């Protein structure tokens, strides 16, 4: 997969993934891979927006060759920033985030791994994954960039989690 004749190349190839699982629990598949801006729109403009997905569902957009699981070599020493959103906000947030990621707005060298939008029962969750959780200059820069590129509600909690780090929870 290479950019075509007069397309606009990207800094990396990326791969779209989709998953549907159950809470409390191979269920993750590749949708397609792109090498240019025009090719990205060719996938993305024909995809269901995360705000119209049903179930316990996620879209993942990752650098080609990185699997959206933490055990992956590029992910095992990393972490993610997490933003929890009310229903109605995820689709616009996901678009602004993937356009920022693709256009190289983060400026953190090779640290970015990919992004996930997670549809849950009563909230959506957007995350961005990076290589090195202990790299405070990188995670600080990622946090600030998210604030520059997303229109978030005031009061919005952002939270970093390293991957290695009453009744049962039934709905989510």
């Amino acid at each position: 997969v290479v950019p075509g004749p007069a397309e606009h190349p990207l800094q990396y190839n990326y791969t779209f993934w989709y998953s549907r699982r159950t809470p409390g629990r191979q269920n993750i598949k590749q949708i397609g891979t792109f090498a240019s801006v025009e090719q990205f729109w060719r996938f993305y403009s024909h995809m269901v927006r995360p705000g119209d997905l049903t179930g316990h569902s996620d879209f993942h957009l990752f650098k080609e060759g990185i699997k959206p699981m933490w055990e992956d070599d590029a992910n095992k020493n990393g972490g993610k920033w997490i933003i929890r959103l009310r229903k109605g906000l995820a689709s616009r947030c996901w678009e602004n985030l993937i356009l920022a990621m693709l256009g190289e707005q983060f400026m953190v060298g090779e640290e970015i791994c990919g992004a996930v939008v997670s549809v849950r029962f009563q909230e959506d969750i957007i995350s961005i994954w990076n290589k090195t959780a202990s790299d405070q200059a990188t995670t600080a820069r990622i946090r600030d960039t998210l604030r520059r590129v997303l229109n978030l509600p005031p009061n919005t909690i952002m939270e970093y989690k390293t991957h290695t780090d009453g009744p049962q929870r039934l709905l989510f």
Binding site: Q11, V37, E104, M107, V149
Partner: peptide, 16 residues
């Protein structure tokens, strides 16, 4: 590094 502004990226959406 290959850097794209959001405006530019959006404008490409109308190019086949």
């Amino acid at each position: 590094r290959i850097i794209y502004d959001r405006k530019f990226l959006m404008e490409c959406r109308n190019s086949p």
